[PDB]
Design a protein around this ligand. Structure first.
Ligand SMILES: CC(C)CC(=O)SCCNC(=O)CCNC(=O)[C@H](O)C(C)(C)COP(=O)(O)OP(=O)(O)OC[C@H]1O[C@@H](n2cnc3c(N)ncnc32)[C@H](O)[C@@H]1OP(=O)(O)O
Ligand SMILES: CSC[C@H]1O[C@@H](n2cnc3c(N)ncnc32)[C@H](O)[C@@H]1O
Ligand SMILES: [Cl-]
Ligand SMILES: [Cl-]
Length: 211
């Protein structure tokens, strides 16, 4: 059926129209729904400094329609946490490791909310990272994510004190990538695999080491 596609520099030649579609959806969702005004752009494309040649996109596709997704960025490069929110990780420190990738821009289009897609996206990050040998993901997230992580069996390590970010309680954390976590989620989503990887093989950890 419908899968989450891993899109990176090595295979984005197969996904250019999907990528542009998702940048516009990100504008509709993060700017026009969430009112994250600092991200507003006059081209109607929500693209930031962490959308470059090293970004990996995990996008939920129904045919060629983007219905959800999230992205991963190597912490061996300057990251959102290290550059924008380092104060959120003052207790434990901002991650910087080929085996830790920064996880952001999680979305589900309105048509697919409160359905099966959300748990599939949770499974997708675990599946991709385990495949790649990535040990943890790091994130800056609003505190309402904590019960969502717990519901999916995500092992969470807070990195600092929660703080207000533009009127919203926000925190920095890592999530442990676990085979055990993934196995339970595969059972729950009723599929042995949720991540589709078309085109040339991606060696994410090798690429992060170059950075
Ligand atoms: C990598 C990640 C950890 C860091 C991030 O990227 S944070 C960015 C979060 N993204 C967004 O807010 C984009 C706009 N929203 C969406 O795409 C979706 O609403 C999702 C957040 C993906 C959740 O979709 P899904 O689980 O399918 O279903 P729902 O939308 O009904 O949400 C389910 C329950 O999640 C909670 N929730 C979702 N959005 C918010 C919010 N803004 N503030 C507080 N709580 C929220 C809420 O409990 C909701 O259930 P109800 O209380 O509405 O019944
Ligand atoms: C990630 S927590 C949500 C807050 O982070 C902000 N944000 C998300 N991405 C970026 C970025 N690349 N640079 C600066 N602020 C950002 C949003 O505008 C919102 O205020
Ligand atoms: Cl661009
Ligand atoms: Cl984000």
């Amino acid at each position: 059926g419908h899968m989450i596609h891993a899109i990176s520099a090595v295979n984005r030649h197969l996904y250019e129209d999907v990528l542009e579609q998702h940048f516009r959806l990100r504008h509709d969702i993060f700017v026009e729904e969430r009112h994250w005004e600092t991200l507003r752009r006059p081209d109607g494309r929500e693209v930031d400094s962490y959308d470059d040649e090293d970004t990996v996109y995990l996008l939920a596709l129904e045919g060629r329609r983007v219905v959800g997704g999230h992205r991963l960025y190597p912490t061996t490069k300057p990251s959102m946490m290290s550059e924008v929110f380092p104060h959120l990780a003052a207790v434990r420190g901002c991650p910087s490791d080929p085996l830790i990738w920064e996880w952001s821009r999680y979305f589900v289009v309105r048509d697919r909310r409160d359905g099966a897609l959300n748990l599939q996206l949770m499974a997708a990050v675990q599946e991709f990272c385990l495949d790649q040998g990535i040990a943890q993901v790091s994130a800056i997230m609003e505190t309402w994510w904590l019960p969502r992580f717990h519901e999916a069996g995500f092992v969470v390590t807070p990195l600092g004190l929660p703080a207000l970010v533009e009127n919203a309680w926000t925190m920095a954390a890592t999530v442990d990538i676990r085979r055990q976590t993934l196995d339970v989620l595969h059972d729950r989503i009723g599929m042995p695999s949720i991540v589709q990887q078309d085109g040339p093989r991606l060696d994410a950890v090798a690429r992060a080491n170059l950075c």
